[PDB]
Write a protein that binds this ligand. Sequence first.
Ligand code: HL4
Ligand code: HL4
Ligand code: FE
Ligand code: FE
Ligand code: OH
Ligand code: OH
Ligand code: ZN
Ligand code: ZN
Lengths: 318, 318
Amino acid sequence: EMVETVCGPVPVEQLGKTLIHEHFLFGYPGFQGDVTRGTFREDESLRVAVEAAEKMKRHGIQTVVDPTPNDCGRNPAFLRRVAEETGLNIICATGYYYPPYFQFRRLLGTAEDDIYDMFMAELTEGIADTGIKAGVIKLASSKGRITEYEKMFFRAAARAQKETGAVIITHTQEGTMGPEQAAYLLEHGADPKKIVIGHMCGNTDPDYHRKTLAYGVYIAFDCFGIQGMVGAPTDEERVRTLLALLRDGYEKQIMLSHNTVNVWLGRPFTLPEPFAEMMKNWHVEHLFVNIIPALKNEGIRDEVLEQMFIGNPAALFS
Amino acid sequence: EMVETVCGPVPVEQLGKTLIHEHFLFGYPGFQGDVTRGTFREDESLRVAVEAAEKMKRHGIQTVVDPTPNDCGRNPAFLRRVAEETGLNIICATGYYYPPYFQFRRLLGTAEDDIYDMFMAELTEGIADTGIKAGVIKLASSKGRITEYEKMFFRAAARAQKETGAVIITHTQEGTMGPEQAAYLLEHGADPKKIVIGHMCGNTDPDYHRKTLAYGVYIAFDCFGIQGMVGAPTDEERVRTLLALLRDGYEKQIMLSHNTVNVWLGRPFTLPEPFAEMMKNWHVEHLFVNIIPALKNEGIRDEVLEQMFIGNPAALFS
Ligand SMILES: CCCC(=O)N[C@H]1CCOC1=O
Ligand SMILES: CCCC(=O)N[C@H]1CCOC1=O
Ligand SMILES: [Fe+3]
Ligand SMILES: [Fe+3]
Ligand SMILES: [O-]
Ligand SMILES: [O-]
Ligand SMILES: [Zn+2]
Ligand SMILES: [Zn+2]
């Protein structure tokens, strides 16, 4: 029926056309240490975010999932300000990026319990004093493995999902562990229809994807526009991969996004022109402007795309 | 002549009796993600900190070095409030606890430069907008090695020390790398008389210490009261070790402290009773009330102790 957004509960029927994975703000853990050179300018950042939101509304986006983790600068009140200004629905996450705070607590024996308690509080009571609840649980695993640290979060996540029916969204590292993540969450009682395995576009072998899809989870091709960095494949390889699965009838299990960071937290930087040109398409219109057109030209039907941006999010949250 | 404190520049002659290593606030990196259950209560925390400061003043402490790293909740304005209330001098640090924020920047090729630039700005311009400058650079290495990540900070630190004459204070992990740290900083032009190698009390082999002292650096026995946790020796083993070096004439190179955390950031916790009893003496009076008395009884002279708490800090900062 309902999903919690940064502006409170909203009917799932009303979510409409949705990007499953975008960041208004994001910083890599440790950004907070770099405050003297990386101080947060709220009014300018709000301007950039409101601009990004409007752009999305231009292409009929009514809802955005912003899964920024707790230790990556998640800022619910700021997201609420963006939503209040634009009418955009924004759903935020509870979760951590892929030690030693939770490692210390593991020494105390309470760590996995504390993580569960955190998920429950943020899903059912509210984030800090913002009075905002998260709508998704955010998980991430490492390249080629789900570490013992990460598994605590996975187990906590599963446990929390059973109580709340919250959606789980995942991050996979460099195209690994898709099936392992799905299998492990299912072992601990999670519901596949409530799970999105993210960053699947980081692997070009459609066999890998089918292995993941066999579990009945959603997968996200959510890194469109990211090329030539962090061992990423090109958008063409993504399209090629995506086409294979669409033709094989998997549309009810696939969702698309860019994983943009519209305001970087911490110290400003400039990608060097080696990297810069390859990333030039990493913005929130790129799906609408460049990717979807190519898909049409390869005979993907509007009924199919609507399953991805409208039907799938709707089913996911219902 | 002068050292920067949280209340601005102060003549070194006026620093007086000094604890080289205590924390008013501290949290392990990642504490900020646990905001919903670990929210910071400023007025209560300020009360506890002011209490801790008064305790120290009772035993003639005029100056405290608080080397809380940037990503561990370092809060200069808060420290300034404690100092303004108590007349205590508090010197704070610039530095990081022992990825991926600075790992990402290493991908950009600017990381070590950015770190240096951060040290320079915080030593010579100010921390954020607080108008407070750090008085020490804070470094830490891992158990049994100084990683390539950590070396960036070491090289940045050395470089900064040459420009500013700032003091470097270090953390060693479980009694390793003392001599390596000293040797590496010296290779890059750091001045041994401006370096304190911390957590030396984590190793009980006085040969290890002498190896470190041969470089002409200060060493800190700064974990008094910490027992039965993370490879910590007992205070008795510390005393035994300390006595060997005092009798061998190293007093001009040794300093003492407790490495207290008076307000933990993040989620409150309680130590289990197995751990809790061993740690019962971990407070800022313990040196004064239990350790120094034992040293007197083993015939350590007041002239010697004064070299440690007064002469050494004074020489260190001058
Ligand atoms: C420039 C490299 C790509 C990148 O940083 N993507 C961001 C999006 C949010 O989480 C990520 O790591
Ligand atoms: C309870 C274990 C001991 C402990 O927490 N020491 C703290 C002091 C400050 O930096 C440390 O890591
Ligand atoms: Fe992301
Ligand atoms: Fe410390
Ligand atoms: O991401
Ligand atoms: O410490
Ligand atoms: Zn991700
Ligand atoms: Zn330390």
